[PDB]
């Protein structure tokens, strides 16, 4: 563990500090091509409006399938990609776009059927007016999204950069009711990075003190569900490996991600950030 901390630091010296290797790797990464990588379903005429960003469409081989029988639009399609870590049965996350007005019922169906109870949201809803994600929850009281009643139970504001919202999610078909906890990071702007890595890391720690430990996937979204969402996942997967002890390849770990959803980590600056974040956390642990 501390052992693996020093192993990560060694890696950081060769891949974060050496700017040449950063570039080279990112250049490698940009050209990297997943196989398979078809997204024919996502590119159907019928699913065009269910996609926010034409640049980031879920692969046919790695998409969440809504149960068409319970679907709002009688369709299985949602732009969400399961993301496996250890286990090919149980994906650790579902990365998905910011739900659109057209797809909110769908987003909740995926939350219900995935058994998900922790959501991570890494965008504000608007950026100097530029919409990122539809306001898919009620700011007070109850809203109905198809057969999914969502009630806002409470809302806890930790700091300038993040808050938590607690929901009750009732399936009106089955009369069941679950608590879904939504972690909302507010200072991570489109195609950019947080100013404080310390905030994003504490935010992560809070996400995981609440998740620990559940079968169901964490639902991570932002905008395209690639850039920020992927930097989170990448940062979070690499520290989990430290969490449980040998070898470390962050570039290779990112490939594993891009095998499962295109676009993951949109910028070299974001990649640089994910690295800097892992390093800083590992500097803190080892300091103690
Ligand atoms: Cl089909």
Short mmCIF file of C-alpha atoms in Angstrom, two decimals, residues 55-255:
data_model
loop_
_atom_site.label_atom_id
_atom_site.label_comp_id
_atom_site.label_asym_id
_atom_site.label_seq_id
_atom_site.Cartn_x
_atom_site.Cartn_y
_atom_site.Cartn_z
CA UNK A 55 -18.67 13.55 -30.47
CA UNK A 56 -19.36 10.97 -27.65
CA UNK A 57 -21.76 8.16 -28.52
CA UNK A 58 -21.96 4.90 -26.54
CA UNK A 59 -20.34 1.83 -28.18
CA UNK A 60 -22.68 -1.00 -29.14
CA UNK A 61 -20.50 -3.41 -27.13
CA UNK A 62 -20.66 -1.38 -23.88
CA UNK A 63 -24.08 0.36 -23.43
CA UNK A 64 -26.72 0.22 -20.69
CA UNK A 65 -29.89 -1.48 -21.93
CA UNK A 66 -33.10 -0.06 -20.60
CA UNK A 67 -35.86 -2.64 -20.28
CA UNK A 68 -37.98 -1.72 -23.30
CA UNK A 69 -41.08 -3.10 -21.49
CA UNK A 70 -40.86 -0.33 -18.83
CA UNK A 71 -39.41 2.37 -21.10
CA UNK A 72 -41.04 5.74 -21.63
CA UNK A 73 -40.32 5.67 -25.40
CA UNK A 74 -40.53 1.85 -25.73
CA UNK A 75 -36.80 1.77 -26.51
CA UNK A 76 -33.71 0.25 -24.89
CA UNK A 77 -31.37 3.10 -25.93
CA UNK A 78 -29.65 5.47 -23.52
CA UNK A 79 -26.32 7.17 -24.01
CA UNK A 80 -24.71 5.50 -21.00
CA UNK A 81 -21.77 3.13 -20.89
CA UNK A 82 -21.17 0.63 -18.10
CA UNK A 83 -17.52 0.83 -16.91
CA UNK A 84 -15.96 -2.35 -15.41
CA UNK A 85 -13.00 -2.36 -13.03
CA UNK A 86 -12.27 -5.71 -11.46
CA UNK A 87 -15.44 -7.59 -12.25
CA UNK A 88 -16.89 -8.14 -15.79
CA UNK A 89 -20.26 -9.00 -14.17
CA UNK A 90 -20.66 -5.88 -12.02
CA UNK A 91 -19.53 -2.60 -13.52
CA UNK A 92 -18.02 -0.16 -10.98
CA UNK A 93 -19.56 2.86 -12.75
CA UNK A 94 -22.02 3.94 -15.42
CA UNK A 95 -20.71 7.05 -17.24
CA UNK A 96 -23.50 8.89 -19.00
CA UNK A 97 -24.21 12.30 -20.62
CA UNK A 98 -26.14 15.04 -18.79
CA UNK A 99 -29.74 13.91 -19.30
CA UNK A 100 -31.68 16.03 -21.79
CA UNK A 101 -35.30 17.12 -21.41
CA UNK A 102 -36.12 14.33 -23.91
CA UNK A 103 -34.32 11.71 -21.77
CA UNK A 104 -35.01 12.43 -18.09
CA UNK A 105 -37.52 9.57 -17.67
CA UNK A 106 -34.80 7.46 -19.24
CA UNK A 107 -32.10 8.62 -16.90
CA UNK A 108 -34.26 7.61 -13.88
CA UNK A 109 -35.16 4.26 -15.43
CA UNK A 110 -31.41 3.56 -15.62
CA UNK A 111 -30.98 4.67 -12.02
CA UNK A 112 -33.82 2.40 -10.91
CA UNK A 113 -32.89 -0.69 -12.91
CA UNK A 114 -29.16 -0.39 -12.20
CA UNK A 115 -29.91 -0.40 -8.45
CA UNK A 116 -27.79 2.74 -8.31
CA UNK A 117 -27.99 4.83 -5.15
CA UNK A 118 -24.99 7.13 -5.50
CA UNK A 119 -24.86 9.63 -8.40
CA UNK A 120 -21.87 11.85 -9.09
CA UNK A 121 -22.56 15.05 -11.05
CA UNK A 122 -19.48 17.00 -12.22
CA UNK A 123 -21.00 19.94 -14.10
CA UNK A 124 -23.07 22.97 -13.18
CA UNK A 125 -26.35 23.11 -15.15
CA UNK A 126 -25.26 26.24 -17.08
CA UNK A 127 -21.93 27.96 -17.85
CA UNK A 128 -22.19 31.66 -18.47
CA UNK A 129 -25.54 30.70 -20.08
CA UNK A 130 -24.30 27.62 -21.95
CA UNK A 131 -26.47 24.69 -20.82
CA UNK A 132 -24.61 21.52 -19.77
CA UNK A 133 -27.28 19.34 -18.20
CA UNK A 134 -31.06 19.59 -17.78
CA UNK A 135 -32.33 20.20 -14.25
CA UNK A 136 -33.41 16.55 -13.90
CA UNK A 137 -34.48 16.85 -10.23
CA UNK A 138 -36.96 18.95 -8.19
CA UNK A 139 -35.50 21.99 -6.39
CA UNK A 140 -38.17 21.46 -3.74
CA UNK A 141 -40.74 18.72 -3.18
CA UNK A 142 -41.81 16.10 -5.70
CA UNK A 143 -41.62 15.70 -9.48
CA UNK A 144 -42.93 12.86 -11.64
CA UNK A 145 -40.76 11.49 -14.47
CA UNK A 146 -42.87 8.82 -16.26
CA UNK A 147 -43.46 6.17 -13.53
CA UNK A 148 -40.60 7.59 -11.38
CA UNK A 149 -41.58 9.98 -8.58
CA UNK A 150 -38.50 11.88 -7.27
CA UNK A 151 -38.76 13.74 -3.93
CA UNK A 152 -35.99 16.04 -2.68
CA UNK A 153 -35.53 15.00 0.95
CA UNK A 154 -32.59 17.22 1.97
CA UNK A 155 -29.54 19.02 0.59
CA UNK A 156 -26.18 19.46 2.33
CA UNK A 157 -23.69 22.08 1.15
CA UNK A 158 -20.16 21.13 2.23
CA UNK A 159 -18.28 23.96 0.51
CA UNK A 160 -18.02 26.47 -2.38
CA UNK A 161 -17.09 23.63 -4.77
CA UNK A 162 -19.47 20.77 -3.78
CA UNK A 163 -22.81 19.72 -2.20
CA UNK A 164 -24.96 16.60 -1.62
CA UNK A 165 -28.64 16.13 -2.38
CA UNK A 166 -30.69 13.29 -0.93
CA UNK A 167 -33.63 11.86 -2.97
CA UNK A 168 -36.45 9.39 -2.46
CA UNK A 169 -37.09 7.55 -5.70
CA UNK A 170 -40.44 5.72 -5.95
CA UNK A 171 -41.26 3.29 -8.72
CA UNK A 172 -44.99 3.84 -9.23
CA UNK A 173 -45.36 0.50 -11.09
CA UNK A 174 -43.97 -1.56 -8.17
CA UNK A 175 -44.64 0.69 -5.16
CA UNK A 176 -40.94 0.35 -4.11
CA UNK A 177 -38.98 3.34 -2.69
CA UNK A 178 -35.18 3.93 -2.64
CA UNK A 179 -32.84 6.63 -1.35
CA UNK A 180 -30.51 7.97 -4.13
CA UNK A 181 -27.69 10.28 -2.95
CA UNK A 182 -26.44 12.89 -5.49
CA UNK A 183 -22.91 14.33 -5.11
CA UNK A 184 -22.65 17.60 -7.06
CA UNK A 185 -19.31 19.14 -7.79
CA UNK A 186 -19.86 22.78 -8.81
CA UNK A 187 -16.43 24.11 -9.87
CA UNK A 188 -15.44 21.84 -12.73
CA UNK A 189 -16.15 23.72 -15.92
CA UNK A 190 -16.53 22.19 -19.40
CA UNK A 191 -13.25 21.06 -21.05
CA UNK A 192 -11.30 22.34 -18.03
CA UNK A 193 -10.03 21.31 -14.63
CA UNK A 194 -10.88 22.22 -11.01
CA UNK A 195 -8.63 24.95 -9.51
CA UNK A 196 -8.06 22.94 -6.38
CA UNK A 197 -7.19 19.32 -6.68
CA UNK A 198 -7.70 19.25 -2.89
CA UNK A 199 -11.45 19.88 -3.35
CA UNK A 200 -12.02 17.20 -5.99
CA UNK A 201 -10.15 14.71 -3.76
CA UNK A 202 -12.14 15.51 -0.63
CA UNK A 203 -15.26 15.30 -2.78
CA UNK A 204 -14.15 11.86 -3.90
CA UNK A 205 -13.57 10.79 -0.32
CA UNK A 206 -17.12 11.85 0.54
CA UNK A 207 -18.57 10.07 -2.49
CA UNK A 208 -16.89 6.83 -1.36
CA UNK A 209 -17.56 7.04 2.39
CA UNK A 210 -21.20 6.99 1.24
CA UNK A 211 -20.85 4.24 -1.43
CA UNK A 212 -18.72 1.98 0.73
CA UNK A 213 -19.47 -0.69 -0.22
CA UNK A 214 -22.20 -1.62 -2.69
CA UNK A 215 -22.73 -3.98 -5.60
CA UNK A 216 -24.52 -1.42 -7.79
CA UNK A 217 -22.68 1.00 -10.13
CA UNK A 218 -21.98 4.63 -9.28
CA UNK A 219 -23.64 6.81 -11.96
CA UNK A 220 -21.18 9.51 -13.05
CA UNK A 221 -22.29 12.25 -15.40
CA UNK A 222 -21.25 15.62 -16.61
CA UNK A 223 -21.97 16.95 -20.06
CA UNK A 224 -20.84 14.54 -22.83
CA UNK A 225 -20.18 12.11 -19.93
CA UNK A 226 -16.62 11.78 -21.18
CA UNK A 227 -14.32 14.65 -20.31
CA UNK A 228 -14.82 15.43 -16.69
CA UNK A 229 -16.65 12.19 -15.95
CA UNK A 230 -13.65 10.26 -17.29
CA UNK A 231 -11.07 12.25 -15.36
CA UNK A 232 -13.01 11.48 -12.20
CA UNK A 233 -13.22 7.78 -13.01
CA UNK A 234 -9.56 7.62 -14.04
CA UNK A 235 -8.49 9.45 -10.81
CA UNK A 236 -10.78 7.29 -8.76
CA UNK A 237 -9.76 3.95 -10.28
CA UNK A 238 -6.06 4.64 -9.83
CA UNK A 239 -6.32 5.52 -6.15
CA UNK A 240 -8.50 2.42 -5.53
CA UNK A 241 -5.58 0.35 -6.85
CA UNK A 242 -3.38 1.99 -4.21
CA UNK A 243 -6.18 1.22 -1.78
CA UNK A 244 -5.50 -2.49 -2.35
CA UNK A 245 -1.79 -3.03 -3.21
CA UNK A 246 1.92 -3.93 -7.54
CA UNK A 247 2.30 -2.34 -11.03
CA UNK A 248 0.81 1.01 -12.17
CA UNK A 249 0.11 2.26 -15.71
CA UNK A 250 -2.20 5.26 -15.75
CA UNK A 251 -2.04 5.58 -19.60
CA UNK A 252 -3.02 1.90 -19.84
CA UNK A 253 -5.76 2.39 -17.25
CA UNK A 254 -7.17 5.18 -19.44
CA UNK A 255 -7.13 2.86 -22.45
#
